[PDB]
Amino acid sequence: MRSVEQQLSIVTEAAVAPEPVRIAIAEALGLMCAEEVQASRALPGFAQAAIDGYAVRAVDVGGEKSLKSLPVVGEVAAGSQQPLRLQPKQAVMVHTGAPLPMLADAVLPMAWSDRGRKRVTAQRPVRSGEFVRKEGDDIQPGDIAVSAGAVLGPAQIGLLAAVGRSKVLVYPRPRMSVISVGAELVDIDRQPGLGQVYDVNSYSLAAAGREAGADVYRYGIAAGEPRRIKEIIESQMLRSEIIVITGAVGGAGSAGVRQVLNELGDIDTERVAMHPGSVQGFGLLGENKIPCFLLPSNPVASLVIFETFVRPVVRMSLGKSNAARRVVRARALNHVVSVAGRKGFIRSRLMRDAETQDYLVEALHLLAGLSEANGMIRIPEDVTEIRPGDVVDVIFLA
Amino acid sequence: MRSVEQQLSIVTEAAVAPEPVRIAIAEALGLMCAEEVQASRALPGFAQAAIDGYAVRAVDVGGKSLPVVGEVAAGSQQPLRLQPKQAVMVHTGAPLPMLADAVLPMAWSDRGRKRVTAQRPVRSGEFVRKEGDDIQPGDIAVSAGAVLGPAQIGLLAAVGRSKVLVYPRPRMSVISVGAELVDIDRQPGLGQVYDVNSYSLAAAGREAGADVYRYGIAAGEPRRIKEIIESQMLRSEIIVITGAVGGAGSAGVRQVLNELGDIDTERVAMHPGSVQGFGLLGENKIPCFLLPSNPVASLVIFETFVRPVVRMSLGKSNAARRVVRARALNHVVSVAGRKGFIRSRLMRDAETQDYLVEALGSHLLAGLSEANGMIRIPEDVTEIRPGDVVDVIFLAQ
Ligand code: NA
Ligand code: NA
């Protein structure tokens, strides 16, 4: 029997970091960038009018007096695809965002002119560069758009699109395969007969894997002789950083599946000094030693084991810096018993007392265990009783 | 010009609550359940061994060796009858033989295969999961209004429900309009600009909790644009269109939008993002946000008005973002009478754990890069100087 601390050390030390992948930028939302992204295109990609007015050479509208009419030879709107070159002493009507004519260096505001349609007279001077959004004003080639290690949010995705990057290298979510094993199991579209039970765990643990941040594939029930089970597990090893199997621990009924797991890797089935969920296992499969969690058939115990050991492996594989959960001290509302020598993890309801802002916790047979829990009372190994009014550690299930 | 409060009030009241949908239970994770789900069968449907051992009558082991007359594994579908003073080996989960009432654990016996000696007694019912121990008919597995987490998904599977009625995420269509726009896999020619906003606003819609379809660039004459918008109305609770306010470039799309509903383009007393619009399209009055081409302003408008509508469509009551007080690090300018939303970087001072904020508002590259917050400047405040304590909207990732 190992402690919770020793088991957590084993599984976390074995965690496999997924290899970076290059993906379309929209699919990178919430993922950590795995490369430094430099802009290859300027933003804006061309000099633009910053206001409605007339693209000119500043010197032709008094732009160098601080050191009369001009022909209007074109009109440019946003999206214009035709090249336009400004000759000396010429003006081109421009709308905000329009591509500036070549050889212009300023925009005379509409309000600073007589608004002439064929010939325009400047009523006030503009200096060179004024009211122009120059090419590369916001971003130049070589500028760092996204740094390695940054989480890609909506603004970063917008930045990638603004510099013409359609794909980006990211650290992907760890891939998890969830498998249920047992001759008693039937899927939820079937009618269980004598000796048959619905496959609860593949659905609940796949959901817990998604909430933890993994890229989860629910295989469901793996049925057949051990060689067929081995075939199934091997196929999941090709596509997984984490494998979770229920029904592989418990007794003689899983001797065959454990035999096949021993042919695929190093399997450890030493118990953990915890409750519920003392009976569990952990293996490293294949040449890359992929973590394989062996969980029991009990759905409540499996969820507790998943939260205690699988979720931290998911979080570190994601590049997260807080692996564990927040732990708060709360006042017990009801009586709880615990095994002497085993750490207790009691699914509970954590609340704030309106009259004192103090945290209160209520401990919550399958219906009660699978009910609405936002906390787990963490009972030390040597503690055997919790009474109302006792202050206890509560793991907050955010 | 209307205030931020007035515009937020307008869009919130127009939010469309999605109709419930029946979906596969795995796809219901994190959604609110829209129906009461009752168990129809007792769980388990049969007495099963809770451990490896010997199914017996407790009285026969002192609750004297017993002959072992069979072995039952998990998944056995045939009934088996235990005679007096007999034992049958059982695996965990195996159906208990009829007329047995307890399981003697393997470790509490001499492990005999033909005759078994109990080392200590077990009482009636011990190590047995009786029929209906887990769930009884009529038991409420999931209540209407409960959020479906992993445990509730497990409960739905335990009562044999493959599908469940839920309140779905609001469907949002994101559309970009403008003759200058090209998609990001193209090489922009003369006058062409990458379509930034459809990507950034679709991503913001997903983070807000919407079911987002990014239509991308809607191109063509106004009648074709109307055709596109009408198709998006069939599948949306929210529509977001950029490039429909700004100038002459959007005259066509505003014309067809006015044919589909009542469009309001009154400016909002805010900066950035004063230029915007809002309409309700078709007989189902689908909210339609008209956002500008400026990507920073569009993200600010989305955060300020679209995100609350998403959260309102989800039925959430908790405030939008957390607001923390922080010490200003640099100077910020604001117009009197307009609410400021300045993208900023919020940090904690190591020497005192106090919150500090640095305003990032060229500035677009920095503003969209290292930003985790927005300084919220009141209408009557015209300047923030270093050392000022200000409200910072925390943009949690
Ligand atoms: Na204990
Ligand atoms: Na102000």
Q: How far is A329 from chain B (nearest CA, A)?
A: 22
Write the class of the CATH domain A327-396.
mainly beta
Q: Look at strands B193-194 and B181-182 and give their pairing.
A: parallel
DSSP type of residue B362:
-
The residue to which tokens 């000696």 are assigned: B117
Q: What CA–CA distance (Å, rounded) separates B119 from B104?
A: 9
Domain A4-18+173-318 maps to which CATH number in 3.40.50.2300, 3.10.20.310, 3.40.980.10, 3.40.190.80? 3.40.980.10
Q: HEC profile for B185-242?
A: CCCCCCCCEECCHHHHHHHHHHHHCCEEEEEEEECCCHHHHHHHHHHHHCCCCEEEEE
3-state secondary structure of B168: coil
How remote is the CA of residue A380 from the centroid of ligand 1, in Å?
5
Cα angle vertex B367, ends A165, B182, to 5°?
Answer: 35
CA A45 from chain centre, in angstroms, equals: 32
DSSP type of residue A251:
S
Which residues on chain A are in Cβ contact (under 8 Å) with B192? 45, 79, 81
**Whether residue B44 has a cis bond before it, omega within 30° of 0:** yes
The residue to which tokens 């009934």 are assigned: B79
Task: Indicate the burial class of A261 (C-beta count within 10 angstroms; 0-12, 13-18, 19 or more).
Answer: buried
Contact A199, A188 (CB under 8 A): yes
**If we measure between CA atoms, which residue out of A197, A295, A224 comes closest to residue B76?**
A197
What are the contacts of B82-89 at 24+ separation with CB within 8 A?
Answer: B82/B55, B82/B56, B82/B57, B84/B57, B84/B60, B85/B60, B86/B56, B86/B60, B87/B54, B87/B55, B87/B56, B87/B60, B87/B116, B88/B54, B88/B55, B89/B53, B89/B54, B89/B55, B89/B113
Q: How far is B278 from chain A (nearest CA, A)?
A: 22
Task: For residue B204, give both structure tokens.
Answer: 């913001």
CATH number of B323-394: 2.40.340.10
Contact A312, A12 (CB under 8 A): yes
Contact B157 A200 (CB under 8 A): yes
Please, which residues 232-261 of chain B have a Cβ atom closer than 8 Å to chain A? 246-249
How remote is the CA of residue B339 from the centroid of ligand 2, in Å?
5
Contact B204 A83 (CB under 8 A): no
Contact A192 B45 (CB under 8 A): yes
Q: How far is A287 from chain B (nearest CA, A)?
A: 32
Partners of B240 in beta bridges? B174, B289
In whole angstroms, how far apart are CA A158 and each of A36, A383, B187, B365, B368?
Answer: 16, 54, 17, 11, 8
Please, which residues 301-320 of chain B have a Cβ atom closer than 8 Å to chain A? none
| Nearest listed ligand to the Cα of residue B335 | 2
**If we measure between CA atoms, which residue out of B115, B218, B121 comes closest to residue B176?**
B218
| Polymer length in residues for chain A | 398
A8–B contact, CB cutoff 8 A: no
How remote is the CA of residue A248 from the centroid of ligand 1, in Å?
26
DSSP string for B87-105: EEEE-TTPBPPBT--EEEE
Contact B345, B309 (CB under 8 A): no
CB-nearest to B135 from A139, A366, A372 is A366
Chain breaks in chain A (C to N over 2.5 A) after: 67, 364
Q: In 10 A of CB A169, how many CB atoms? A: 17
B194–A contact, CB cutoff 8 A: yes
Q: In 10 A of CB A142, how many CB atoms? A: 8
Q: What CA–CA distance (Å, rounded) separates B132 from B136?
A: 5
| Polymer length in residues for chain B | 397
B23–A contact, CB cutoff 8 A: no
Kindly tell me the sign of the dihedral angle through the C-alpha atoms of B192, B198, B204, B207: negative
A129–B contact, CB cutoff 8 A: no
CATH topology assigned to domain B48-129: Molybdopterin biosynthesis moeA protein; domain 3 (2.170.190)
* Domain map (residue ranges) of chain B: 4-17+169-314, 48-129, 323-394
Kindly tell me the sign of the dihedral angle through the C-alpha atoms of A227, A230, A232, A234: negative
CATH 3.40.980.10 is held by the domain B4-17+169-314: yes
In whole angstroms, how far apart are CA A110 and each of A120, A122, A123, A124?
Answer: 10, 9, 10, 11
How remote is the CA of residue B271 from the centroid of ligand 2, in Å?
8
Q: What CA–CA distance (Å, rounded) separates A214 from A235?
A: 18
| Nearest listed ligand to the Cα of residue B340 | 2
Task: For residue B155, give both structure tokens.
Answer: 């409960």
**If we measure between CA atoms, which residue out of B150, B153, B155 comes closest to residue A214?**
B150
CB-nearest to A81 from B161, B191, B397 is B191
Question: At B104, which amino acid appears?
Answer: L
Q: What CA–CA distance (Å, rounded) separates A12 from A311?
A: 10
Task: Indicate the burial class of A382 (C-beta count within 10 angstroms; 0-12, 13-18, 19 or more).
Answer: exposed
B189–A contact, CB cutoff 8 A: yes
B299–A contact, CB cutoff 8 A: yes
Q: Look at strands B238-242 and B286-291 and give their pairing.
A: parallel
A38–B contact, CB cutoff 8 A: no
Contact A365 B77 (CB under 8 A): no
DSSP string for B250-311: GHHHHHHHHHHEEEE---BSEES--S-EEEEETTTTEEEEEE-S-HHHHHHHIIIIIHHHHH
| Separation of first and last alpha carbons in chain B | 32
How remote is the CA of residue B341 from the centroid of ligand 2, in Å?
10
| Nearest listed ligand to the Cα of residue B336 | 2
Task: For residue A272, give both structure tokens.
Answer: 């953990």
Q: What CA–CA distance (Å, rounded) separates A323 from A316?
A: 6
In whole angstroms, how far apart are CA A288 and each of A283, A284, B313?
Answer: 12, 8, 46
Question: At A390, which amino acid appears?
Answer: D
| Cβ pairs bridging A and B (under 8 Å) | 246
In whole angstroms, how far apart are CA A116 and each of A57, A78, A111?
Answer: 17, 21, 11
Q: How far is A150 from chain B (nearest CA, A)?
A: 9
Contact B74 A253 (CB under 8 A): yes
Task: Go through A330-346 and write b for each residue having 16 or more CB atoms within 10 A of its CB, e for each that does not.
Answer: bbbbeebebbeebbbbb
Please, which residues 65-104 of chain A have a Cβ atom closer than 8 Å to chain B? 77-83, 95-99
Q: What CA–CA distance (Å, rounded) separates B158 from B44?
A: 9
Contacts of residue B283, defined as CB under 8 A and 6 or more positions apart, other chains included, come to none
3-state secondary structure of B249: helix
Residue in chain A nearest B367 by alpha carbon: A155
Question: At A115, which amino acid appears?
Answer: R
Q: HEC profile for A100-153?
A: CCECCCEEEEHHHECCCCCEEEECCCCCCCCCEECCCCCECCCCEEECCCCECC
In whole angstroms, how far apart are CA B130 and each of A323, B126, B136, B166?
Answer: 39, 10, 11, 33
Please, which residues 322-361 of chain B have a Cβ atom closer than 8 Å to chain A? none
How remote is the CA of residue A4 from the centroid of ligand 1, in Å?
12
**If we measure between CA atoms, which residue out of B3, B12, B2, B7 comes closest to residue B309?**
B12
Contact A313, A242 (CB under 8 A): yes
**If we measure between CA atoms, which residue out of A302, A310, A312 comes closest to residue A247?**
A302
Which residues on chain B are in Cβ contact (under 8 Å) with A82? 190
Contact B280, B14 (CB under 8 A): yes
Q: In 10 A of CB B113, how many CB atoms? A: 8
Contacts of residue B13, defined as CB under 8 A and 6 or more positions apart, other chains included, come to none
The residue to which tokens 């009529």 are assigned: B138
Q: In 10 A of CB A134, how many CB atoms? A: 16
Q: What CA–CA distance (Å, rounded) separates A95 from A51?
A: 6
Q: What CA–CA distance (Å, rounded) separates B189 from B181?
A: 10
Please tell me the number of Cα atoms within 13 Å of A325 on its side-chain side.
19
Contact B57, B101 (CB under 8 A): yes
B397–A contact, CB cutoff 8 A: yes
Backbone angles phi, psi at A322, to 5 degrees: -95, 105
Q: What CA–CA distance (Å, rounded) separates B28 from B19?
A: 15
Which residues on chain B are in Cβ contact (under 8 Å) with A365? 133-134
* Resolution (Å units): 2.1
Backbone angles phi, psi at B106, to 5 degrees: -50, -45
CB-nearest to A79 from B91, B149, B179 is B179
Q: What CA–CA distance (Å, rounded) separates A265 from A247?
A: 18
Angle between helices B222-233 and B251-260 in degrees, nearest 10: 40
Q: What CA–CA distance (Å, rounded) separates A6 from A270?
A: 11
Q: What is the dihedral of CA A195, B89, A270, A303, to 10 degrees?
A: 20
Q: What CA–CA distance (Å, rounded) separates A260 from A262?
A: 5
Interface test with B, best of A160, A188, A244 (most B CBs within 10 A): A188
Chain breaks in chain B (C to N over 2.5 A) after: 63, 361
